[PDB]
# Entry
Amino acid sequence: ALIEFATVNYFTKSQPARAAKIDRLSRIAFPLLFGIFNLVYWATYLNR
Amino acid sequence: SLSFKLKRNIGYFILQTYMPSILITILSWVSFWINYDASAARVALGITTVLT
Ligand SMILES: *[C@@H]1O[C@H](CO)[C@@H](O[C@@H]2O[C@H](CO)[C@@H](O[C@@H]3O[C@H](CO[C@H]4O[C@H](CO)[C@@H](O)[C@H](O)[C@@H]4O)[C@@H](O)[C@H](O[C@H]4O[C@H](CO)[C@@H](O)[C@H](O)[C@@H]4O)[C@@H]3O)[C@H](O)[C@H]2NC(C)=O)[C@H](O)[C@H]1NC(C)=O
# Structure
């Protein structure tokens, strides 16, 4: 997340479209990936 | 005399002290990608990193 913010700030004031697009994609990608990881982890460690 | 030669395993220390400091140094380096017009952000990075 911190590196994503750094990238967004880098591309701000030069390619605002790219920065906005990557921020919008991250807002969905990060929570979904975290939830999938949590599901997999708990499933694989609560059934052994 | 009965002697033992003990070699210390390092994995615990990699997990405990080496990786965190490496990551904190990377964090420190993140400061150089922030526009040098922002003072509060870069000083926040540096001071927080030092204290960590
Ligand atoms: C962990 O730590 C301990 C503590 O230091 C180590 O213990 C030492 O082990 C070495 C060898 O394993 C000991 O050295 C041995 O000394 C014997 C007696 O020495 C006499 O002869 C020499 C001259 O050869 C004189 O200078 C000395 O004053 C004595 O009069 C030797 O007999 C041993 O063999 C030697 O000679 C034969 C001859 O056939 C050779 O083949 C050998 O290669 C070797 O040259 C050997 O030298 C040493 O004394 C121990 N320490 C103490 C305080 O006694 C452990 O080795 C170390 N490691 C581990 C895994 O525990």
In short: The two ends of chain A are 32 Å apart (CA to CA). The helical segments of chain A are 2-11, 16-46. Chain A touches chain B at residues 2-3, 6, 9-10, 13 (CB under 8 Å).
